[PDB]
């Protein structure tokens, strides 16, 4: 119940535990989604901690995250005990789904996406 400020974030982004999130409903392939997040000084969702990102338990549907074949856009590799990766469509990219799941998806398939910023 102790209070603190969250961010910094742009005003139209969700802030949770100092990370900033934005949902995009216009569907794009994985590469175009990454390009969109970069154009907003951001990256596709990176999952690094269940505790600091427990809001992701509430994120429904299926959204591009920055995981590719596994490693993140920034070149860091997927840490253990974070995501359950399930095959869906033959491919080298992954969609985030609740709760802490990644569905493998062809990187060229259009999908909604989540971008994430941290300052």
Ligand X SMILES: O=C(N[C@H](C(=O)N1C[C@@H]2[C@@H](CO)[C@@H]2C1)c1cccc(C(F)(F)F)c1)c1ccccc1-c1ccc(C(F)(F)F)cc1
Binding site residues, its own copies, CB under 8 A: 1-17, 23, 40-41, 54-55, 58, 60, 119
Name the binder of 38 from its own copies, ligand X, none, CB < 5-8 A by kind: none
Q: Contact with ligand X (CB under 6 A): which of 23, 32, 92, 100?
A: 23
Cross-strand bridge partners of residue 17: none
Residue pair 104/86 in contact (Cβ under 8 Å)? The answer is yes
Residues 91, 106: Cα–Cα separation, whole Å: 4
Query: Cβ neighbours of residue 35 under 8 Å, at least 6 residues apart?
Result: none
Is 60 near ligand X (CB under 6 A)?
yes
- Chain residues that interact with ligand X, rule: CB under 6 A: 14, 21-23, 25, 55, 58-61, 114
């Amino acid at each position: 119940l102790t209070e603190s400020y969250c961010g910094p974030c742009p005003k139209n982004w969700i802030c949770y535990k100092n990370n900033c999130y934005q949902f995009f409903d216009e569907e794009k392939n994985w590469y175009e989604s990454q390009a969109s997040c970069m154009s907003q000084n951001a990256s596709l969702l990176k999952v690094y901690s269940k505790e600091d990102q427990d809001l992701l338990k509430l994120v429904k549907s299926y959204h591009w995250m920055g995981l590719v074949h596994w490693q993140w856009e920034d070149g860091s590799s997927l840490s253990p005990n974070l995501l359950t990766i399930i095959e869906m469509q033959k491919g080298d990219c992954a969609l985030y789904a609740s709760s802490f799941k990644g569905y493998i998806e062809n990187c060229s398939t259009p999908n909604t996406y989540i971008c994430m910023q941290r300052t």
